[PDB]
Design a protein around this ligand. Structure first.
Ligand SMILES: *[C@@H]1O[C@H](CO)[C@@H](O[C@@H]2O[C@H](CO)[C@@H](O)[C@H](O)[C@H]2NC(C)=O)[C@H](O)[C@H]1NC(C)=O
Ligand SMILES: *[C@@H]1O[C@H](CO)[C@@H](O[C@@H]2O[C@H](CO)[C@@H](O)[C@H](O)[C@H]2NC(C)=O)[C@H](O)[C@H]1NC(C)=O
Ligand code: NAG
Ligand code: NAG
Lengths: 49, 63, 14
């Protein structure tokens, strides 16, 4: 969105990109999609606490 | 039944056909076995769709 | 103008 015009991307695909960007194949995210979302949610709650 | 993922780019489509293309520029390719990788299956990936992945070897074996 | 080699050809013939 900050590169010029903004381009819509389904959120899980934005994550697939971000994961690929750190060396892990874009299959990890789907195998663990619920795990990843749950860990994320937990971490945010921990910050607020 | 196996799950094919882009090696790079995104799987996208118009009203009738799926193509794979680089994220920053629309240049649709035929989705083939040389464009995808396989990992896991259709029982796991959420949002996976039904299509045919083309194998360039088949006609060479027959020709 | 030059050529590009395709490794499959001799495999189909062998
Ligand atoms: C990777 O680590 C995570 C986090 O410890 C594992 O997920 C947990 O698994 C236990 C059961 O052993 C569940 O009770 C927890 O609720 C799970 N956590 C979440 C956020 O879902 C995960 O199973 C491990 N995966 C592998 C392949 O080892
Ligand atoms: C989606 O894109 C494809 C690719 O250009 C269009 O299908 C082509 O249509 C021409 C003209 O009839 C044929 O000669 C090609 O063989 C077709 N390509 C393929 C892969 O079948 C298709 O019409 C487009 N669909 C929509 C809804 O716009
Ligand atoms: C996309 O959203 C619609 C509407 O909520 C839902 O029915 C569909 O299952 C969702 N698909 C995926 C892959 O999340
Ligand atoms: C593909 O079609 C089969 C039936 O031949 C069906 O059982 C399966 O769920 C479909 N898969 C997807 C991703 O639509």
């Amino acid at each position: 969105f900050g590169a010029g015009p903004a381009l819509q991307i389904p959120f899980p695909m934005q994550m697939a990109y971000r994961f690929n960007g750190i060396g892990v194949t874009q299959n990890v995210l789907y195998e663990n999609q619920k795990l990843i979302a749950n860990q994320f949610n937990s971490a945010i709650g921990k910050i607020q606490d | 039944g196996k799950a094919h993922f882009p090696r790079e780019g995104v799987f996208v489509s118009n009203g009738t056909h799926w193509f794979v293309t680089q994220r920053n520029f629309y240049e649709p390719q035929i989705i083939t076995t040389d464009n995808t990788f396989v990992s896991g299956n259709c029982d796991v990936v959420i949002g996976i769709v039904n299509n045919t992945v083309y194998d360039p070897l088949q006609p060479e074996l027959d020709s």
